[PDB]
Amino acid sequence: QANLMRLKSDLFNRSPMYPGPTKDDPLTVTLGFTLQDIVKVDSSTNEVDLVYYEQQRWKLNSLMWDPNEYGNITDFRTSAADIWTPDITAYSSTRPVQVLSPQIAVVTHDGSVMFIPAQRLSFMCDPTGVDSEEGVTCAVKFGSWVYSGFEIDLKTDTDQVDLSSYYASSKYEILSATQTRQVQHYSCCPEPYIDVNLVVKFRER
Amino acid sequence: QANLMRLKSDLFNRSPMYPGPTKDDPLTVTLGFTLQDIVKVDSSTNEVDLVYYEQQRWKLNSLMWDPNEYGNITDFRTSAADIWTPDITAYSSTRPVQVLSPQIAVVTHDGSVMFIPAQRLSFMCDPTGVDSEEGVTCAVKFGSWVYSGFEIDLKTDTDQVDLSSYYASSKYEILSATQTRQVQHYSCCPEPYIDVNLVVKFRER
Amino acid sequence: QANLMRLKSDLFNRSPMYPGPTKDDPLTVTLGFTLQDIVKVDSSTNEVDLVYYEQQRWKLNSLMWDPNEYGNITDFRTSAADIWTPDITAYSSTRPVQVLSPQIAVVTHDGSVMFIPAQRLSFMCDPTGVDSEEGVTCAVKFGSWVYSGFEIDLKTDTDQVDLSSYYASSKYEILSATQTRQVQHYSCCPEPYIDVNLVVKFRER
Amino acid sequence: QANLMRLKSDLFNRSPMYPGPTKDDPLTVTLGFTLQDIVKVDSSTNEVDLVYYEQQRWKLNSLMWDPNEYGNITDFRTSAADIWTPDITAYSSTRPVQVLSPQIAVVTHDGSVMFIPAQRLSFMCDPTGVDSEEGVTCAVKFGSWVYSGFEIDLKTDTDQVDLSSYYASSKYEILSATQTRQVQHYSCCPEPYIDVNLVVKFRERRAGNGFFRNLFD
Amino acid sequence: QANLMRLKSDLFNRSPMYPGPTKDDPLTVTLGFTLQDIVKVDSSTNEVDLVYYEQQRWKLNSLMWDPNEYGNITDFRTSAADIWTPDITAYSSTRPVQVLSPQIAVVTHDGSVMFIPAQRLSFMCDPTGVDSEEGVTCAVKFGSWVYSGFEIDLKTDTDQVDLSSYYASSKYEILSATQTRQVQHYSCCPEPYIDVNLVVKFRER
Ligand SMILES: c1ccc(C[N@@H+]2[C@@H]3CC[C@H]2C[C@@H](OC2c4ccccc4CCc4ccccc42)C3)cc1
Ligand SMILES: c1ccc(C[N@@H+]2[C@@H]3CC[C@H]2C[C@@H](OC2c4ccccc4CCc4ccccc42)C3)cc1
Ligand SMILES: c1ccc(C[N@H+]2[C@@H]3CC[C@H]2C[C@@H](OC2c4ccccc4CCc4ccccc42)C3)cc1
């Protein structure tokens, strides 16, 4: 505790918070989804509700430290309010996302942060054909709300959504779930736009 | 980060926050809507729920800086709690507006601020006829709650609401969507009052 | 901006907040209602839901200033958290009041404050007969929760509720809406209590 | 305003808050209910919803002052976040209690504090038989969550719930409502626990003016 | 009061808050459940709603004192916001947990803390068969969100959930309820992960 308090103080109280990325100093955030449940489908409003947890990762030189100076501590946990977090959001949600987990992050001595909020999300999706053998496919994009691809570069580690914790007795069964980086360019607008497209194909059990 | 930290410190910690406009120093705010979804209609209460995002824009001298003094940085993103924002509100909502996006704004060296809250709104609207070929029109005004036209002047860049991201598989289709600056005048008072009237004509798919 | 910053600072950072009224220094508050919609009726719980905005007004010697000393500024807007506000509450609500407008108030150089929260309120009301020509009458009292009439004197400017902004296509039409000051005693206490009685007569369109 | 500001400052800024009661310095809290409405019943979850206001009263020496030294001020209102309050809770609720009144309290020069939150509560209750001439009875215990009877002693002034503001046109009519102090035990623990047991017997409305005759309007 | 004020001040104002455990200084948290009610089942979403209370216990050298120096005080209550708490969370909820009790803990002179939040939880569970003699089983794991078993070691005192306050007129009867410590190891990483699995078998009354 002596040594950890000393590290946290040295990292957080001796200088302001990371101000976020610029064009000259971009930052790469990695995203991944572990999909736990399709809880509910509303065919009268074309809204579907997901429960998942979303792995967010990035690396900052300012959160970097030598373990030998702090009792061989190599990583620590701290409230997410003590650090910058990227403004990643679902672009087509219909309710404010609900947070299901303590808002804490893991910081590693190399400056890696790992943040994994569990969320329930309602989003835009017509579930028509969900009750066929064939199912229905729905999509939702995730990305930064105000940073372009010149400041925040998104990335995935895999295109397969982790289904190893999907609720086996869910009401809907997953036929496929992928997570794909998209880059997009619109001649109106000098900057590129990056998102991760969460595509889920599912049907009634 | 060195430079942007300095800038943010200079802009935000060396002086108080912009106190908002007065009659001698009015401010012009520009509003525009991007309509994503008519989620739901309640014919028993005459309430309709929209999901959209609202582009707010203004310019303050106090937020201005010379890029050559801050590592050629020309703009930055920062939390909306760091800056003044206009009190723009829907005048005929029936629930508190629910915010769907992270509350961050973009600030540019010329003193421009761009703030873009994504919201779900319930508002007063009689959807009788929504199931005809002919649809129903419904209207909701937006404007400052406590500033007259002598302190905040509202403006739109175009009268066409942006429908380029309207959900194709929504449950209601949009027949037309406009956004019009209006100048009201209550028979008591001299000050002008100013709103942007969102009018949506729509029908059941 | 320079002058208004100076004013606000002078008013809000040079002394503590108004502590509220006392028996020796009572404060008069004026209340008025602008009724926008009867949204909903629930005949299984006898709960009715109103959207309105409530005009609150009072005057404080400590919020008073000479315009000549502050660039001829005669009034300003500020966040309702910077000033004392009266604890005016509905006495027969069934859910916490929901606030629908930005929490900002206008302060005038004579010390007048004006505050206009928009609210949705659910409250105790039997709507049996709403479907007749003749409608049903329901009532809700507003007043300070903890201050007697010796500290806070409530007042109306008129007994008529303002219906100039009642939603034309509401599902219920208003036959009459009055707002009446009532003085009410108890044996415990020399002190009179004041409420404003909102009485709405309405029916199904 | 000068004098009150001075008083509040003296009481609140010159020392820390009351840390709460100890076994050597217990505190007695007096509870009373005013029942406004049984709003709702859900026979598919056995949850009933009450709207009431709860009168909490207690007395601290550290909140005490001589009026003569503060412009003959004998009492004042202040935000409940400025003072200690007791952790009184419903023991069998099914949702977080919702607060319907401003969180303000009244403090008196003898150190008395009075705090009266209006609340809506959902709680465990099987309303089967609510539609009979004979009604259903439901019960909910209120007490401290973490302080035993050696630290907080609960009390009621009367065992009758106040029904003088029960909603006349409610959907359910009250046949009886009481509020009784109770002293629990358990094998583990020599230390008594104290609750106030709110018991309400009610039915589905059958006449414009309720079950019991009463003279006064 | 004098002595307890002195103690709270000494424990809480003289030094920072406990920063949380580390590999070199792990902390053992004991968990136990007292189940009050299965409130509700939703067979259309496979969500069940529990009301329970969760006993949490741990011990910290920094919260330790000698009673002889503080008027023979041996323990005290204080707001959970004054001390560190573990980030114990349900792993398969479908809504944010709702807290039904005041957030206060008991601290003992030996450094033991005891914290007992009453909660309502909606969580993933298929209730098909609940209406049989035979009932249905459901399970939800609890554990730290971001601390591994090298930092937080979870324990139970007993595997039996306390049913001595289960609602006798609940709508569902409890056939069995157990709480079991589990250790899992993932191929990614060297450190073990601990959870307490709450298993409840029930049926319709
Ligand atoms: C200056 C003005 C506006 C913004 C807001 N961003 C703009 C518009 C929304 C957000 C993120 C991005 O727009 C994304 C977005 C993201 C990827 C591909 C296309 C789009 C098209 C508009 C859109 C519509 C709904 C929801 C999200 C988006 C760029 C940011 C800076
Ligand atoms: C429904 C219809 C119109 C509105 C528009 N706002 C409402 C009314 C005008 C504007 C701003 C404000 O009205 C102001 C107003 C503005 C600031 C503070 C108080 C008031 C109420 C006094 C007043 C008196 C005469 C004319 C206007 C006003 C609230 C709001 C809801
Ligand atoms: C369903 C089953 C289990 C959980 C909770 N566990 C899962 C895995 C450990 C623990 C909390 C968290 O996972 C930790 C974990 C813990 C802290 C910070 C990051 C991570 C990253 C996911 C991960 C990957 C490999 C090994 C451990 C972890 C989610 C949540 C949902």
XYZ file of N, CA and C and ligand atoms in Angstrom, chain A residues 91 144-146 184 186 193 195, chain B residues 36 53 106 114 116 165, ligand 1:
73
model
N -23.326 4.143 -32.258
C -23.925 5.153 -33.109
C -25.451 5.048 -33.292
N -15.539 6.504 -31.793
C -15.422 7.758 -31.090
C -16.545 8.701 -31.530
N -17.028 9.538 -30.637
C -18.079 10.460 -31.006
C -17.559 11.727 -31.655
N -16.388 12.196 -31.231
C -15.863 13.473 -31.719
C -14.429 13.467 -32.284
N -13.844 4.775 -43.645
C -14.782 5.373 -44.531
C -14.387 6.806 -44.855
N -15.628 10.347 -47.063
C -16.704 11.111 -47.682
C -16.179 12.420 -48.253
N -13.240 8.296 -41.274
C -14.077 7.840 -40.175
C -13.982 6.338 -39.944
N -14.883 2.948 -37.527
C -15.797 2.360 -36.567
C -15.499 0.889 -36.494
N -32.437 10.182 -36.819
C -32.087 8.781 -36.958
C -33.238 7.823 -36.919
N -29.524 13.456 -33.525
C -28.460 14.211 -32.920
C -28.523 15.650 -33.422
N -15.920 20.078 -29.441
C -14.745 20.378 -30.226
C -14.539 21.869 -30.127
N -18.153 23.340 -31.257
C -19.140 22.475 -31.867
C -19.531 21.375 -30.858
N -22.565 18.319 -29.997
C -23.464 17.468 -30.821
C -24.188 16.394 -30.017
N -28.834 9.412 -42.465
C -28.663 8.325 -41.514
C -29.967 7.852 -40.870
C -17.787 17.900 -35.448
C -19.132 17.866 -35.795
C -19.871 16.741 -35.477
C -19.279 15.695 -34.798
C -20.130 14.458 -34.449
N -19.557 13.262 -35.127
C -19.784 13.315 -36.576
C -21.271 13.004 -36.732
C -21.611 12.173 -35.488
C -20.292 12.068 -34.731
C -19.529 10.859 -35.244
C -19.433 10.841 -36.776
O -20.664 10.609 -37.352
C -20.983 9.227 -37.257
C -20.587 8.382 -38.500
C -19.604 7.414 -38.205
C -19.136 6.518 -39.165
C -19.657 6.586 -40.458
C -20.642 7.529 -40.759
C -21.116 8.432 -39.787
C -22.202 9.335 -40.382
C -23.000 10.244 -39.452
C -23.394 9.622 -38.117
C -24.762 9.555 -37.913
C -25.278 9.005 -36.741
C -24.405 8.549 -35.783
C -23.028 8.641 -35.974
C -22.517 9.185 -37.148
C -18.971 12.202 -37.241
C -17.928 15.745 -34.456
C -17.166 16.851 -34.770
